[PDB]
RNA sequence: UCUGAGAGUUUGAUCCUGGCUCAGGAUUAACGCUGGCGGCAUGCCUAAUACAUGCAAGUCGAUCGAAAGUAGUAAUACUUUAGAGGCGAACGGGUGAGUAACACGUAUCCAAUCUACCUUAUAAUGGGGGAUAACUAGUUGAAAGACUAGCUAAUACCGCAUAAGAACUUUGGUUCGAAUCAAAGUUGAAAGGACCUGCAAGGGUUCGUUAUUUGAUGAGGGUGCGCCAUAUCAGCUAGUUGGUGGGGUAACGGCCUACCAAGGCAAUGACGUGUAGCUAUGCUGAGAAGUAGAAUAGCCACAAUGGGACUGAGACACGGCCCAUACUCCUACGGGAGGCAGCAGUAGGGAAUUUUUCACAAUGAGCGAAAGCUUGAUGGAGCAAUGCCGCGUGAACGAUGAAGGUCUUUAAGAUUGUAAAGUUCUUUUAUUUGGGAAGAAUGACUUUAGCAGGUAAUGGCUAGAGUUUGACUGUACCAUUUUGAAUAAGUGACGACUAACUAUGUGCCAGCAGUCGCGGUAAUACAUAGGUCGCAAGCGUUAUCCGGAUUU
């Protein structure tokens, strides 16, 4: 779902989080088991390579709030150019607008960044942007449409976040610039991307 | 027109006035985009001479454009 | 182009066999001086095809028939498409603004003119009186006027008088004007006036006394002139008659024999003069849709407003929607919207439909009635507005037919295409309902005599190419049999890969106090409890089909007196399988008695034709020994069986000349006699 | 729909009659030459058929074929 | 950098040959549940079945006579067409029944083909006659009209003469079945209109006529190779096969005809039969290949069925002509009118696939010198979750888990669940107010200046400015533009095949399913409840071809 509205269930079932860890704040029991009611001693019924491939696929996809058909479209465009497609998929996925928006320290979550972008609260190349499905190119800036610079959330979270090493920003004017491609060893990830590459058999 | 709705297209194509659009022809002279007009047109400037020298004068709507490019001046040299 | 004073929307609304069809036919014949009709000379060379009244009325009805006169062009409509109906004339008089009703002179009890007369009396729409029969037996003026005044009591004011007896009519009198002579026979094509002699001057004075004496309620200066004796001008007295007409309190009577076509043009002059113009009379005061139902009207202005009332179907074109243009001179070809249904109905061609052809006029003036082509989703009641004006719903009274005939076609595919056609027919012409009951599958239709179903089958077979034969009303009865003593239900078979067994003994007791209840009389536990609940349901699944034909067994108690099974055998289903078996056998012995649906019939009668009604009710197995009256009219209640009331509907209709209707309500189910149960099986 | 097709419907009939007349005199000259072969008949055929070949009745190919086949028998003397 | 996924099933167990299904993509697609939004794309696969109504190619008065009008005694300036005449109606537009064959596709040759109109130069645009429509008159009739006499005009028609060059035959130059180049005989051309300079004089200028000469364009013609199945189709064939002479085609040829003569093709599949629009390509596969040949484009085919022919450069002609046949419509019954496989639309069939729509603003075509006119081609609009794609139903804080469901069935506790209750932020979309472009600087028109064979001028070409053409649209986009999370979730599965489990009811019963098969008292496999997972504004369901499949 493009807007799930419930992420804690996915976090508990997958043991992962989009942030470092903020989806367990002791509001009751802090349990790392699966949500719902299926028995706390059961794990699953089928645990083959298909199961773990699917599990990692859902993890990677739901870490970005993307739909499966658009993911297949992205893979199809990835097959155009060649190289180390395993890390190239990550590099292209991170080039989406909201990903770099978080990497800019603008907003903690991609969902919040999408909400900001869609409602017309972002300017890029003197054109209004309403979708994060933009293939960012090296050497592009992003403005903030200073009328909407009065958003309390971005103003508060500009300093209290972490800036990725492959991006820069003059957060005083709240404008950032893409420096270079992202790297695997600089971002927090442990996903077996080979499973993602092998699973999709549409191509 | 050809191409895309609200984004028209018409290739500058060598053809004789006998058939419909987008069919049999002889040569592909070039193309013009009316969607962005800044006095520029894809013209070979050489094959158009051969097309003009064997009859089959182009579509009437391009005469001013060819005069802007400078093809009429060198084409009327025959009648000089 | 035209002045709204000239254009007029009138019509003829009268009972059949009183000349309504004939007078409309001949009026179109002799008034065809406009090329759309052109019947005056082009109907004499051709031979007029006379087939029936049904087909001619179906294919000649034109909601907009425009005729040209000296200055004023008229637009007429012939609404009555049945023996008599209330909602069709409701729509018509709601959209039209002129009523001409004829009086009977052959079967002069006036059955179906009185109904429309009372409707108009409650409607208060301008209406005039004319008589088709003048040169025929039983068609004298004095008896007619005396009878209508005595019975109806509407304060009519006849103005013109005939010359001669009811068969030697040879001249026409106008009370304020000269006398009309005749050069030829009918067709009234030559007009000339001559002075009046004493032999007519006496009646001129006599009837002018009544003419000007009653008009005293208008412009008292006329009363002063009558007191003085000075001659009163025609203009002022006719304006007073105009005021009376627009006030809907004065009703003049015309003369002429339209059956042999004497007195046509003077009728035109009288109706165009006495009746108001659609520009001087305010439009129909309808209630809007805002939360108040306030009265609104555009007064023939720019905003196009229209309420759908007639929707006919025709091949090669589609849906022809006869609607009234209350206001707005619109364009031929647009996209109007209706808010109550939220869909842009397409305006493709605004046409006038005539008897022999069609004519699509480019623009139609406000206050007119016309058809539109297309309109694929039109339902009667929607407001057609696209000039930024709120919608409206005019509703004062409506009626739905309850006279029911239960029939069935003779082929399955015939039934399918009949359903496909009747859904569209109900979508286009709401004048009846349709019911499908799960008894066997039957169309319970709403009719008005046999003629309604004849129109149904005609409009089906002539257009849709369908073969169909109507059926008889088929209904069921409930069942209840004698309380037995014992039954012997045995199940013996080696099947199912195991042992199948069951031994059931039940005394079956029907009750009329409560519904079904199961009683367990197995005290020793010889049968398991877990095997009881299914076979219970089996009886509950066998209470729908009896032992004779499947008649409904309703609210019957079951008490399992004795039973036995096999410890390692006797599969459970066999129990319920046996449950229907034994219940049949003893059920055959029980000889059940039926339970018929008894209903109540409320009939309002003027207490002058109650003999036939009471005799028919007595013949229909009812209890009648007197009357119960609502202090001025008798509304008799009768207990009736449903098995014979369907024919009784039309029997009562014909016995009372259609003057008395009724309403059906469900009373209860009552015990049957043996004369009903001997018909239970063939 | 169509408004001037009847113009061509009545136009061709008289022209067709004229062309039939030209063809008939051509055939008469050809038969006269076939009766006996001599220079004057061939010259008359030329003078009366070249005008027909000028206009659109008989193409010049058939005219050339006819005169070649006539001069063949003329030279067969 | 690039090229190949398996699993289940017959037996007590195992191996092996072999078959079936599932795990993949997809459409001319449909069904059931639903249901924000934009762009793009797509929308009779069946009945080549009939088709109501309107629209579907006309144009030229600067071609002609005749006829009306505006103002003007008259001359006249202009708008029009009933007709003649000229051009174009042979294009464009659709539909796939026949056709299994030089039809198509492909490379080619026409010592066998025309090519109006466009490009090149050239001999030139001489002179008369007779014509007939409209109109006038007379019959007939409801109109319809037709019939019969009279008058007219041309770029309509037919003669008179002049010819470079052509055509035709004799003589001589000359060719890898025929062609070049000389002299001669023979023979054929028309038509004017608009404008300028002039008193008249003539000349010039623009269109155009006729004989040419040039290419190009388009069409035709035969051959090489390739291009469905069937042997439960063995011989097929008589203008069929060939020579001679004639005719004829646009040309070459039994294409036709008179005589004469008797083979051609075949087992390497003729011939008969069944099926079928071919091709680029769509889809699948890595590929060899398989499948269908929807849009789109080229070709042929036909235009109610079947025969013919006239017209014109181009037809045997989608809406020209005649006839026959079937069908259908009107009629005052005298006689007529008609062909939606053109655009929408109607009937019927089928499960089923759109509105009886706005304009030539862009492009093309036809005519015209042009102002321009016709354009159901076309550009649009609209319907249609039919497909693809972006896009929303918000976002951030907020319990030892609010209430409650469910479970634990035994409460103690878990779960639904940061989801919610509540706090803050915000308006894609929504509602309201305003500004509001591009698509068209395209074509002409008019004033300026220049160019050209040229003149006294006027006309053609280029450079400059102004006039304008927008159906779409109040579109897009933005704007202290108002309000407020407000206006916005479904559908399949949860035994294994292939991802996620428990309770209750149901007792080989009700019932499930693509496969294994479950249910005879505990069903994780039925019904239902809670929870969970797989996709997503779609989700699943059956049918088609492909992969899996070395299962041709």
């Amino acid at each position: 779902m493009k807007y799930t509205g419930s992420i804690f269930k996915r976090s508990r079932r997958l043991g992962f989080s989009l942030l470092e860890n903020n989806k367990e704040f002791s509001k009751g029991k802090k349990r790392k088991t699966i949500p719902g009611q299926h028995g706390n001693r059961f794990r699953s019924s089928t645990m083959s390579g298909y199961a773990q491939q699917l599990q990692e696929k859902q993890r990677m996809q739901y870490m970005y709030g993307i739909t499966d058909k658009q993911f297949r479209r992205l893979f199809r465009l990835v097959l155009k150019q060649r190289g180390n497609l395993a890390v190239n998929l990550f590099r292209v996925l991170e080039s989406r607008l909201d990903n770099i928006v978080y990497r800019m320290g603008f907003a903690p979550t991609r969902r919040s960044a999408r909400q900001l972008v869609n409602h017309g609260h972002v300017l890029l190349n003197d054109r209004t942007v309403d979708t994060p499905s933009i293939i960012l190119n090296p050497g592009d800036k992003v403005r903030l449409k200073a009328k909407t610079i009065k958003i309390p959330i971005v103003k508060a979270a500009s300093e209290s976040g972490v800036v990725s090493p492959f991006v820069e920003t003059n957060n005083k004017t709240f404008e950032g610039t893409y420096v270079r491609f992202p790297e695997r060893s600089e971002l927090p990830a442990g996903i077996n991307e080979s499973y993602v590459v092998e699973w999709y058999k549409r191509l | 027109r050809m191409g895309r709705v609200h984004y028209p297209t018409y290739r500058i194509v060598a053809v004789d006035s006998r058939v419909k659009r987008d069919g049999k022809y002889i040569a592909l002279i070039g193309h013009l985009n009316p969607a962005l007009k800044e006095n520029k047109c894809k013209i070979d400037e050489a094959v158009a001479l051969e097309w003009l020298n064997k009859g089959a004068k182009p579509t009437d709507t391009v005469r001013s454009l060819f005069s802007q490019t400078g093809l009429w001046k060198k084409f009327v040299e025959s009648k000089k | 182009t035209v002045d709204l004073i000239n254009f007029r929307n009138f019509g003829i609304m009268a009972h059949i066999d009183a000349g309504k069809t004939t007078t409309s036919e001949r009026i179109l014949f002799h008034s065809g001086r406009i090329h759309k009709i052109g019947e005056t000379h082009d109907g004499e060379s051709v031979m007029d095809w006379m087939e029936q009244e049904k087909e001619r009325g179906i294919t000649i009805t034109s909601a907009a028939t425009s005729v040209s006169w000296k200055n004023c062009s008229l637009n007429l409509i012939d609404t009555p498409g049945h023996v008599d109906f209330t909602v069709e004339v409701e729509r018509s008089l709601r959209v039209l603004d002129g009523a001409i009703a004829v009086l009977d002179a052959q079967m002069g009890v006036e059955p179906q003119t009185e109904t429309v007369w009372r409707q108009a009396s409650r409607y208060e729409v301008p209406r005039i009186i004319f008589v088709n029969k003048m040169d025929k037996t039983g068609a004298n003026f004095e008896r007619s006027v005396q009878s209508i005044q005595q019975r109806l009591g509407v304060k009519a004011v006849p103005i013109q008088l005939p010359i001669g007896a009811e068969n030697d009519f040879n001249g026409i009198i106008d009370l304020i004007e000269e006398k009309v002579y005749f050069f030829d026979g009918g067709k009234e094509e030559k007009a000339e006036e001559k002075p009046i002699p004493d032999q007519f001057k006496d009646q001129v004075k006599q009837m002018r006394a009544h003419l000007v004496e009653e008009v005293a309620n208008f412009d008292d200066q006329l009363m002063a002139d009558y007191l003085e004796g000075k001659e009163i001008s025609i203009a002022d007295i006719k304006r007073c008659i105009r005021k009376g007409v627009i006030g809907c309190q004065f009703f003049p009577v015309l003369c002429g024999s339209a059956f042999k076509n004497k007195g046509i043009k003077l009728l035109l002059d009288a109706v165009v003069d006495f009746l108001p113009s659609p520009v001087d009379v305010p439009q129909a005061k309808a209630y809007g849709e805002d939360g108040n139902e306030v009265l609104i009207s555009a007064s023939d202005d720019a905003p196009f407003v229209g309420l759908a009332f007639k929707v006919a179907t025709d091949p090669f074109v589609g849906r022809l929607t006869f609607v009234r243009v209350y206001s707005g001179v619109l364009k031929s070809g647009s996209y109007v919207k209706n808010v109550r249904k939220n869909k842009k109905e397409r305006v493709s061609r605004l046409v006038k439909m005539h008897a022999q052809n069609r004519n699509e006029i480019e623009e139609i003036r406000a206050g007119d009635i016309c058809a539109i082509i297309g309109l694929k989703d039109t339902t009667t009641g929607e407001t057609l507005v696209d000039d930024k004006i709120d919608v409206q719903l005019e509703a004062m009274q409506f009626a739905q037919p309850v006279i029911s005939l239960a029939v069935e076609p003779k082929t399955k595919a015939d039934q399918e295409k009949m359903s496909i056609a009747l859904s569209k027919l109900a979508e286009e012409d709401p004048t009846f309902k349709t019911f499908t009951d799960p008894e066997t599958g039957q169309t319970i239709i709403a009719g008005m005599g046999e003629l309604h179903l004849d129109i149904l089958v005609d409009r089906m077979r002539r257009e849709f190419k369908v073969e169909v034969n109507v059926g008889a009303p088929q209904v069921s009865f409930r069942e209840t049999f004698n309380k037995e003593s014992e039954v012997e239900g045995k199940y013996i078979k080696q099947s199912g890969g195991r042992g199948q067994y069951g031994h059931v003994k039940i005394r079956f007791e029907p009750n009329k106090d409560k519904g079904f209840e199961f009683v367990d009389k197995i005290v020793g536990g010889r049968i398991p409890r877990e095997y009881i609940k299914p076979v219970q349901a089996g009886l509950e699944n066998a209470m729908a089909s009896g032992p004779l034909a499947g008649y409904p067994m309703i609210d019957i108690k079951a008490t399992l007196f004795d039973g036995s099974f096999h410890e390692v055998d006797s599969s459970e289903m066999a129990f319920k399988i046996a449950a229907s078996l034994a219940l049949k056998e003893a059920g055959k012995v029980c000889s059940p008695v039926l339970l018929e649906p008894i209903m109540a019939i409320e009939v309002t009668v003027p207490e002058q034709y109650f003999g036939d009604t009471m005799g028919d009710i007595s013949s229909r197995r009812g209890l009648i020994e007197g009357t119960e009256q609502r202090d001025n009219v008798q509304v008799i209640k009768a207990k009736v069986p449903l098995k014979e009331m369907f024919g009784y509907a039309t029997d009562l209709r014909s016995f009372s000349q259609g003057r008395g209707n009724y309403v059906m309500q469900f009373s209860h189910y009552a015990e049957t006699p043996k004369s009903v149960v001997n018909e239970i099986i063939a | 729909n169509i408004k001037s097709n009847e113009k061509r419907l009545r136009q061709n009939i008289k022209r067709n009659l004229n062309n039939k007349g030209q063809k008939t005199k051509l055939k008469t000259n050809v038969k006269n030459f076939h009766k006996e072969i001599n220079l004057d008949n061939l010259g008359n055929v030329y003078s009366q058929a070249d005008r027909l070949a000028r206009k659109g009745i008989i193409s010049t190919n058939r005219a050339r074929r006819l005169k070649s086949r006539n001069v063949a028998v003329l030279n067969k003397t």
Side-chain angles (χ1 to χ4, degrees), chain C residues 318-389:
Chain C
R319 294 211 191 281
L320 211 53
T321 61
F322 284 131
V323 295
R324 154 81 151 191
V325 175
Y326 303 81
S327 176
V329 175
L330 212 63
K331 314 282 301 163
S332 176
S334 286
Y335 293 91
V336 305
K337 194 182 281 283
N338 164 77
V339 185
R340 324 161 61 241
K341 195 182 61 83
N342 304 107
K343 204 282 181 193
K344 284 272 211 173
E345 311 276 330
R346 154 81 181 210
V347 175
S348 46
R349 264 151 191 201
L350 301 153
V351 65
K352 284 202 171 303
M353 161 55 158
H354 272 77
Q356 303 274 320
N357 54 17
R358 284 81 71 91
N359 264 317
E360 201 285 329
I361 318 164
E362 211 76 40
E363 291 136 0
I364 308 85
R365 314 311 301 201
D368 193 28
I369 178 174
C370 64
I372 318 164
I373 208 164
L375 271 73
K376 74 182 191 283
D377 203 68
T378 291
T379 71
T380 51
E382 311 276 10
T383 301
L384 281 293
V385 285
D386 73 328
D387 303 357
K388 294 92 201 173
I389 178 64

Side-chain angles (χ1 to χ4, degrees), chain C residues 237-267:
Chain C
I237 68 184
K238 204 172 91 183
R239 284 201 51 81
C240 274
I241 308 294
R242 184 81 51 71
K243 294 142 71 193
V245 165
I246 58 174
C248 305
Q249 303 294 330
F250 264 50
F251 304 120
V253 185
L254 281 183
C255 55
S257 76
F259 204 100
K260 195 162 261 163
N261 314 137
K262 294 172 191 53
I264 288 304
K265 314 192 321 173
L266 61 93
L267 191 143

Side-chain angles (χ1 to χ4, degrees), chain D residues 1-12 14-16 18-19 22-23 25 43 46-47 50-51 54-56 59-62 64-69 71 75:
Chain D
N1 314 277
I2 188 64
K3 194 162 81 163
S4 46
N5 224 27
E6 51 275 20
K7 154 72 161 293
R8 204 71 71 181
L9 171 53
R10 274 81 41 81
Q11 213 284 340
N12 44 7
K14 304 182 291 323
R15 294 251 300 291
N16 194 36
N18 314 327
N19 304 7
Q22 323 294 310
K23 284 162 191 163
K25 34 202 191 193
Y46 284 151
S47 286
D50 293 338
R51 314 231 180 201
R54 174 201 181 181
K55 304 172 311 303
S59 296
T60 181
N61 224 27
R62 184 171 171 80
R64 294 181 191 151
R65 164 151 81 261
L66 191 143
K67 45 182 71 173
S68 46
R69 284 171 181 171
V71 65
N75 264 317

Side-chain angles (χ1 to χ4, degrees), chain C residues 194-246:
Chain C
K194 294 282 321 173
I196 68 184
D198 203 358
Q199 273 94 340
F200 304 100
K201 194 172 71 153
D202 53 328
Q203 313 104 30
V204 165
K205 284 172 181 43
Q206 173 194 10
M207 281 275 198
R208 194 181 281 261
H210 322 107
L211 161 63
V212 185
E213 171 175 280
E214 271 196 50
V215 75
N217 314 337
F218 304 120
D219 213 8
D220 43 358
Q221 183 273 0
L222 281 293
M223 161 55 58
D225 303 348
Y226 204 80
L227 161 73
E228 211 275 350
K230 164 162 61 173
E231 161 66 351
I232 48 184
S233 286
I234 188 154
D236 283 328
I237 68 184
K238 204 172 91 183
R239 284 201 51 81
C240 274
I241 308 294
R242 184 81 51 71
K243 294 142 71 193
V245 165
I246 58 174

Side-chain angles (χ1 to χ4, degrees), chain C residues 548-623:
Chain C
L548 301 173
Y551 293 0
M553 301 275 208
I554 178 64
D555 303 318
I556 308 194
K557 274 172 161 283
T559 71
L560 261 183
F561 264 80
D562 303 78
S564 66
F565 84 112
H566 213 297
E567 61 275 20
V568 185
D569 313 307
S570 76
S571 306
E572 201 175 30
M573 61 185 218
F575 284 81
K576 84 172 61 183
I577 288 164
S580 306
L581 301 193
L583 201 63
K584 164 182 51 53
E585 281 186 50
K588 174 262 301 173
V589 175
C590 284
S591 306
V593 305
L594 281 183
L595 191 63
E596 51 196 350
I598 188 154
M599 311 305 188
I601 288 294
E602 301 285 330
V603 285
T604 181
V605 165
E607 201 196 80
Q608 273 304 140
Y609 313 100
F610 54 100
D612 313 328
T613 71
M614 282 305 98
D616 193 359
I617 298 194
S618 286
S619 306
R620 294 301 161 191
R621 314 141 181 250
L623 261 183

Side-chain angles (χ1 to χ4, degrees), chain C residues 227-474:
Chain C
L227 161 73
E228 211 275 350
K230 164 162 61 173
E231 161 66 351
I232 48 184
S233 286
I234 188 154
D236 283 328
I237 68 184
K238 204 172 91 183
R239 284 201 51 81
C240 274
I241 308 294
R242 184 81 51 71
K243 294 142 71 193
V245 165
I246 58 174
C248 305
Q249 303 294 330
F250 264 50
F251 304 120
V253 185
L254 281 183
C255 55
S257 76
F259 204 100
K260 195 162 261 163
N261 314 137
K262 294 172 191 53
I264 288 304
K265 314 192 321 173
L266 61 93
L267 191 143
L268 301 163
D269 193 38
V271 305
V272 305
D273 263 348
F274 294 150
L275 281 193
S277 176
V279 75
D280 283 348
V281 55
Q283 283 304 270
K285 284 322 191 73
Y287 314 140
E289 321 306 310
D290 73 338
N292 184 7
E293 271 66 40
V294 75
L295 71 173
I296 48 184
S297 176
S299 296
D300 263 8
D301 213 8
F304 194 91
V305 285
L307 271 293
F309 64 91
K310 264 292 191 213
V311 185
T313 181
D314 303 278
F316 304 130
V317 285
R319 294 211 191 281
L320 211 53
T321 61
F322 284 131
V323 295
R324 154 81 151 191
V325 175
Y326 303 81
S327 176
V329 175
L330 212 63
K331 314 282 301 163
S332 176
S334 286
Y335 293 91
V336 305
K337 194 182 281 283
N338 164 77
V339 185
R340 324 161 61 241
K341 195 182 61 83
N342 304 107
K343 204 282 181 193
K344 284 272 211 173
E345 311 276 330
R346 154 81 181 210
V347 175
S348 46
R349 264 151 191 201
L350 301 153
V351 65
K352 284 202 171 303
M353 161 55 158
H354 272 77
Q356 303 274 320
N357 54 17
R358 284 81 71 91
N359 264 317
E360 201 285 329
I361 318 164
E362 211 76 40
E363 291 136 0
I364 308 85
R365 314 311 301 201
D368 193 28
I369 178 174
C370 64
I372 318 164
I373 208 164
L375 271 73
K376 74 182 191 283
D377 203 68
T378 291
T379 71
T380 51
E382 311 276 10
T383 301
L384 281 293
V385 285
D386 73 328
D387 303 357
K388 294 92 201 173
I389 178 64
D390 203 278
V391 305
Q392 53 154 290
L393 271 163
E394 171 156 0
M396 61 175 288
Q397 73 154 70
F398 283 90
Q400 283 294 290
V402 185
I403 308 314
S404 76
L405 261 63
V407 305
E408 181 75 0
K410 74 172 301 293
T411 311
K412 184 202 171 273
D414 163 37
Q415 173 44 30
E416 291 166 330
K417 54 173 181 203
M418 191 55 88
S419 166
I420 308 184
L422 71 83
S423 286
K424 184 182 71 63
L425 171 53
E427 191 166 350
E428 71 206 20
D429 193 338
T431 181
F432 63 110
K433 274 182 101 193
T434 291
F435 304 130
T436 81
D437 283 328
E439 51 186 350
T440 51
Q442 303 204 290
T443 71
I444 288 174
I445 208 74
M448 281 285 168
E450 191 66 80
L451 271 293
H452 203 167
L453 281 83
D454 313 328
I455 298 314
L456 271 293
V457 295
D458 203 18
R459 284 171 50 101
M460 291 315 198
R461 74 181 321 201
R462 284 301 151 261
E463 291 76 350
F464 304 90
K465 184 42 181 193
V466 55
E467 61 96 20
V468 55
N469 294 57
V470 305
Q474 163 64 260

Side-chain angles (χ1 to χ4, degrees), chain C residues 453-496:
Chain C
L453 281 83
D454 313 328
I455 298 314
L456 271 293
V457 295
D458 203 18
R459 284 171 50 101
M460 291 315 198
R461 74 181 321 201
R462 284 301 151 261
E463 291 76 350
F464 304 90
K465 184 42 181 193
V466 55
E467 61 96 20
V468 55
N469 294 57
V470 305
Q474 163 64 260
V475 295
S476 56
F477 294 110
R478 264 71 161 181
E479 201 166 10
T480 291
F481 53 91
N482 304 327
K483 284 182 161 33
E484 51 196 10
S485 46
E486 281 196 350
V487 75
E488 181 156 340
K490 304 302 231 283
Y491 194 90
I492 308 104
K493 214 172 191 303
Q494 183 64 80
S495 46

